Chain length 137, copies 3
Amino acid sequence: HQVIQLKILDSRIGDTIPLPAYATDGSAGLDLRVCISEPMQVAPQQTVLLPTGIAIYIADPKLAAVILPRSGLGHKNGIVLGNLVGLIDSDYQGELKISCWNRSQEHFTVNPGDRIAQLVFIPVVQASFEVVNEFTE
Amino acid sequence: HQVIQLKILDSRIGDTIPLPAYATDGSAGLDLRVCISEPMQVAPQQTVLLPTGIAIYIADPKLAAVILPRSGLGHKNGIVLGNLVGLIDSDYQGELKISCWNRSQEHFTVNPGDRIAQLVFIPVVQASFEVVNEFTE
Amino acid sequence: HQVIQLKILDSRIGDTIPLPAYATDGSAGLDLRVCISEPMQVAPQQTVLLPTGIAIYIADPKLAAVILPRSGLGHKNGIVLGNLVGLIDSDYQGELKISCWNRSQEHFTVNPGDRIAQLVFIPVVQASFEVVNEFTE
Ligand SMILES: O=c1ccn([C@H]2C[C@H](O)[C@@H](COP(=O)(O)O)O2)c(=O)[nH]1
Ligand SMILES: O=c1ccn([C@H]2C[C@H](O)[C@@H](COP(=O)(O)O)O2)c(=O)[nH]1
Ligand SMILES: O=c1ccn([C@H]2C[C@H](O)[C@@H](COP(=O)(O)O)O2)c(=O)[nH]1
């Protein structure tokens, strides 16, 4: 495993709302929960910015994280991400936030502590370009 | 290359509908075909769950796969994924299924065996958190 | 870092429109700018194909790139990608193009040289399948 520093921004986290964790040893992602104080309605076509109450610091520039929709919420309820895929840079230290977009025609309720997205840590490569007139092998 | 076990769930696979394969030596993804018995209409804004007739077992927890829209179908026909990006965990052993979402204003027909998404195998990192009061280097 | 060959297809690139570059040492992605000659309107629900004026050649089959929405444009303006996520194969040598999709209810103007998406280089794994009757460890 790789160590990622995490700062708790809302005292509910770790008390009434658990920290993100892998469901199983073979899980690729961690479910991300929202830290709101009362249930929130997301109308058809509405986008709402939902806080997580946590900040992470990946630090290692060979690593990033992406925020993805949950499969069931996205397929069954059309509850996905307004930016489609959220990209977390290694030097980002602010709160993780979810752009929650209801792409369906049905109203949806988000309760405090609900899992609304998933977080996946991926290696990334920092490219340097070489400008050429023609491509070569 | 890396070996991924594949179980055929529908006898058409490998007979009338080919197994997923890289188009070229330099392809990042494999086209994923649907295993339906008759053509299916996907109306504007409709989401339909489409089977592939295959199950995979990635097994290695340092590896995952993602299901992505095809570029031409998504750009030209608005045929994309209802969950936007499908994440396949290393310990998932069920059938691969596509959440096919028509985001366009035109009706679309999916024929048996059509390529509707693409599958990409990516390394992933399992993070362990360290809860801190302030971030450090 | 890893060297990626880049061919300039429009003489504005590197003169009036900068080459893609990482904003910070810890950035995971590079902002991708559009190479159009006059401002372009993107109406609600409209998809437009926007050129970048550059081609890249990743070459290494263990590497790919993805094109993702920008977070603010996607969350605030609903300016995302019609194919949701663009996948760039290592053997692709054509112009990078953005499927720009306005998922919002507000008209949006794209100016020449605007950053409209981001590009991320990721390692990928080329799988070989082993067809089995039952999965094993
Ligand atoms: O869904 C998202 C996308 C981004 N970010 C964070 C992590 C990014 O590194 C940072 C800056 O976003 P940019 O506008 O620079 O992409 O915002 C989120 O909290 N959620
Ligand atoms: O588009 C998708 C997304 C997920 N899955 C499979 C692989 C996942 O590991 C499994 C469980 O999904 P979750 O609800 O746990 O994300 O479903 C698919 O078949 N297709
Ligand atoms: O948003 C996108 C998606 C793809 N491509 C390029 C890179 C791919 O390797 C190539 C071929 O696309 P396919 O139809 O084979 O996926 O098009 C783009 O320019 N932009």
